[PDB]
Amino acid sequence: SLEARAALNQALEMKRQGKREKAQKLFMHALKMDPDFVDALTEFGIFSEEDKDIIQADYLYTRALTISPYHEKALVNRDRTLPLVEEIDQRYFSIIDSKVKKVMSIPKGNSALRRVMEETYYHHIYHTVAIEGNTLTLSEIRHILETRYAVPGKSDEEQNEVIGMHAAMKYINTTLVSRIGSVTISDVLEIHRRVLGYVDPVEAGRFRTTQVLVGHHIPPHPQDVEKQMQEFVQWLNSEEAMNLHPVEFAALAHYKLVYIHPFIDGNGRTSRLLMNLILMQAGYPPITIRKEQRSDYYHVLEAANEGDVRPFIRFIAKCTETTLDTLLFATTEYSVA
């Protein structure tokens, strides 16, 4: 018996008086105490909706309904929100497409563009290893790759992760981006071969034959991995996927590979590279999930496990905008002497 009903009732009482800042803390607290508490989700939805935060209200109702599909108070409200959410999400994909288009208006040989592209190349390597706890600094990663000399006082393992990423990004940018044709299984194993080849050569480029623990999660049985990965690459080359928005498609491709967890190590890194391969193949620039976005990343992945991928997609879309804003942050300004 969760003792959050107390918290929910006070929240409703505060809301009645109009102490809304005290209400949402009691709402948040009620779902801290019981995250699967239908009345608190539903009531906190209505709350959010009164403040015109439609996406949150809709998330909350959608959570309530994944737990209790027949909860009539939620069913009625999510009918009203779902269409307005589709609208809001669609307008954000338009602003991103705006910035992509402006970025792809820059002549290919532009120097400023050349320099920020290679600056952000080291940024993407730094963030994709640092988000997992790799203690190497940006300047250390540039040092390792520009020269070929190991950084003093940093483990071999950390530095091989960096070289490994570099080896993988070469292979994608050289081979797979330009290449007309299907994204085969062999492509995904080849990325993983390079990602992990310097740290764990034995496992580098082959699927796990064992069960794994990923925190409190247990991904699919190793005998389902082969089946589910063949459904994945079939979906990657399918007509439905090309029917999706490319950012939407890239986000789903990423989440699916994370969920399947087909390798022992380097699923995260291997699926952040696949995401970028998908975006680039569609004419979109590759993107970075910054180190400091670790919590947001975990939480949106967790929301995707609890039956709602939309927050994850929105997350990837915001990361896409933040990349474009950076590329655009190198554009011409009037000046004379």
Numbering used by the authors: 103 to 439
Publication excerpt:
A single ER‐localised Fic protein, FICD (HYPE), catalyses both AMPylation and deAMPylation of BiP. We report on the transition of FICD from a dimeric enzyme, that deAMPylates BiP, to a monomer with potent AMPylation activity. Mechanistically, monomerisation relieves a repressive effect allosterically propagated from the dimer interface to the inhibitory Glu234, thereby permitting AMPylation‐competent binding of MgATP.
Co‐expression of reciprocally tagged FICDs confirmed that the wild‐type protein forms homomeric complexes in cells that are disrupted by a previously characterised Leu258Asp mutation within the major dimerisation surface (Bunney et al, 2014). Size‐exclusion chromatography (SEC) and analytical ultracentrifugation (AUC), with purified proteins, confirmed the stability of the FICD dimer (and EV1D–G). These techniques also reaffirmed the strong disrupting effect of the Leu258Asp mutation (in the principal dimer surface) and revealed a weaker disrupting effect of a Gly299Ser mutation (in the secondary dimer surface; Fig EV1D–G). We therefore conclude that between 0.2 and 5 μM (concentrations at which the experiments that follow were performed), the wild‐type protein is dimeric, FICDL258D is monomeric, and FICDG299S is partially monomeric. Complete monomerisation resulted in a 19‐fold increase in AMPylation activity and a 2‐fold decrease in deAMPylation activity. Monomerisation does not result in large conformational changes in FICD. Accordingly, the greatest root‐mean‐squared deviation (RMSD) between the Fic domain of the FICD:ATP structure and any other monomeric or dimer relay FICD structure is 0.53 Å (observed between FICD:ATP and FICDL258D:Apo; residues 213–407). Notably, in all FICD structures the αinh remains firmly juxtaposed to the core Fic domain. In all ATP‐bound structures, the inhibitory glutamate is displaced from the respective apo ground‐state position, in which it forms an inhibitory salt‐bridge with Arg374 (R2 of the Fic motif).
